[PDB]
Design an enzyme around this catalytic site. Structure first.
Site, PDB file in Angstrom:
ATOM      1  N   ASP A  35      48.292  -1.225  24.370  1.00  0.00           N
ATOM      2  CA  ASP A  35      48.746  -0.973  25.727  1.00  0.00           C
ATOM      3  C   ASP A  35      48.675  -2.156  26.683  1.00  0.00           C
ATOM      4  O   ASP A  35      47.599  -2.507  27.164  1.00  0.00           O
ATOM      5  CB  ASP A  35      47.949   0.210  26.282  1.00  0.00           C
ATOM      6  CG  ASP A  35      48.300   0.532  27.716  1.00  0.00           C
ATOM      7  OD1 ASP A  35      49.477   0.356  28.096  1.00  0.00           O
ATOM      8  OD2 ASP A  35      47.392   0.977  28.446  1.00  0.00           O
ATOM      9  N   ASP A 224      55.063  -2.296  30.284  1.00  0.00           N
ATOM     10  CA  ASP A 224      53.992  -1.435  29.789  1.00  0.00           C
ATOM     11  C   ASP A 224      54.249  -0.809  28.417  1.00  0.00           C
ATOM     12  O   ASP A 224      55.037   0.128  28.299  1.00  0.00           O
ATOM     13  CB  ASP A 224      53.784  -0.332  30.837  1.00  0.00           C
ATOM     14  CG  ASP A 224      52.607   0.559  30.542  1.00  0.00           C
ATOM     15  OD1 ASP A 224      52.102   0.547  29.404  1.00  0.00           O
ATOM     16  OD2 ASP A 224      52.196   1.292  31.463  1.00  0.00           O
TER      17      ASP A 224
END
Ligand SMILES: CCCCCS(=O)(=O)C[C@@H](NC(=O)c1cccnc1)C(=O)N[C@@H](Cc1cc(F)cc(F)c1)[C@H](O)CNCc1cccc(CC)c1
EC number: 3.4.23.46
Length: 375
Positions: A35, A224
């Site tokens: 992430d 992201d």
């Protein structure tokens, strides 16, 4: 950029990409979600209905308790835990071992996903957004400081009962030239907290949305990997859907589709990709008045779940989020050393016979600086 790191990522559609890691001594194996949208390294450290295994501190001879609680709330979902450090390795990554901060998760809410196959998360962003505060050095920082690995990593995220499986590569310390074709174009990392960038222009099927570019970054825009969809600020979202709806008016879908809630299916193999437009996001270049664009095909914003799909574009109240579906089909370089993010057409590029994902530049755009949100 090693051949040993190619294909070191895996996962299921809509449930992200994970890399295998080992923590503690002897090595405890765990699948960790990659992430770039957060900065904490955390792993399930207590039983949970969705966890088949978890970090067991007591079994690690190298574990050191930091005696500090930690809590991390995301867009939706959160977890509470206990801080400590331990030895961490990435079997299919650089051949090194580092002592890193680890948040042993004791309590969680809507964080873990049933059947996702990962037990922890690797926040690859900067210390500024790390919890409790920025004194909690993120994993990548420890890696760079402790080893000789270059301050840079790149991601190649690829597309597709059970949810379609996905694959990809996380190249730590370099750029693997066989993972992309064409040229690499870089956009500056506006600030070192999230991987913040600036969008200066948006086009749906060649047509300009014609909005003040501040809207595109209304609040902020980030790259992201921990987020699936392309998230757009309200005003931009509505213009986007309206444009997409128009282009595909040839057919009609329920409002639930456009709201990314309910899926839409076609006869297997008859998906009418040609009625859906391509989306071009122009990013600020390394030079004033200069930008480049990345074009996304419907094969990217229509996520597989007869062939059934979900609209992978949704409204945001916290800025633009260039999620996984946007990253897919592109080779993305997070050049931390030079404060920039490069984009290039991926080896597992975005398909299609008449169209294809692309990264093109340069395209002159004035006052790109006033496109950002000035704190
Ligand atoms: C990768 C697997 C896909 C899961 C599908 S998702 O719905 O797209 C995940 C997304 N969810 C949504 O975007 C979302 C969820 C519901 C409704 N609308 C949007 C999200 O919150 N993502 C977190 C990673 C995460 C992954 C999970 F698998 C479960 C979680 F819990 C969290 C990012 O770190 C957020 N970067 C922005 C950010 C925001 C706030 C604070 C920080 C400081 C840490 C940072």
């Amino acid at each position: 950029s090693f051949v040993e790191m190619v294909d070191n990522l895996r996962g299921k559609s809509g449930q992200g990409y994970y890399v295998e890691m080992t923590v503690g001594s002897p090595p405890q194996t765990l699948n960790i979600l990659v992430d770039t949208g957060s900065s904490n390294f955390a792993v399930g450290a207590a039983p949970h209905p969705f966890l088949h295994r978890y970090y067991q501190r007591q079994l690690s001879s190298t574990y050191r308790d930091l005696r500090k609680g930690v809590y991390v709330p995301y867009t939706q979902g959160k977890w509470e835990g206990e801080l400590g450090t331990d030895l961490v390795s990435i079997p299919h990554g650089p051949n090194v071992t580092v002592r890193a901060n680890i948040a042993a998760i004791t309590e969680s809410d809507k964080f873990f996903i049933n059947g996702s196959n990962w037990e922890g998360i690797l926040g690859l962003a900067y210390a500024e957004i790390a919890r409790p505060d920025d004194s909690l050095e993120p994993f990548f920082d420890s890696l760079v400081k402790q080893t000789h690995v270059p301050n840079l990593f790149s991601l190649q995220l690829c597309g597709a009962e059970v949810l379609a499986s996905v694959g990809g590569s996380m190249i730590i310390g370099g750029i693997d030239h066989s993972l992309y074709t064409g040229s690499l174009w870089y956009t500056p990392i506006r600030r070192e907290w999230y991987y913040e960038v600036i969008i200066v222009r948006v086009e749906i099927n060649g047509q300009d949305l014609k909005m003040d570019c501040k809207e595109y970054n209304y609040d902020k825009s980030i790259v992201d990997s921990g987020t699936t969809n392309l998230r757009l600020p309200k005003k931009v979202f509505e213009a986007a859907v309206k444009s997409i709806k128009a282009a595909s008016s040839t057919e009609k879908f329920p409002d639930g589709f456009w709201l990314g809630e309910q899926l839409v299916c076609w006869q297997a193999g008859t998906t009418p990709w040609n009625i859906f437009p391509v989306i071009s996001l122009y990013l600020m270049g390394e030079v004033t008045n200069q930008s480049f664009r990345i074009t996304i095909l419907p094969q990217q914003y229509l996520r597989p779940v007869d062939d059934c799909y979900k609209f992978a574009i949704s409204q945001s109240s916290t800025g633009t989020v260039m999620g996984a579906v946007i990253m897919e089909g592109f080779y993305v370089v997070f050049d931390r050393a030079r404060k920039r993010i490069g984009f290039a057409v991926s080896a597992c590029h975005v398909h299609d016979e008449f169209r294809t994902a692309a990264v093109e530049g340069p395209f002159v755009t004035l006052d790109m600086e006033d496109c950002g949100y000035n704190i």
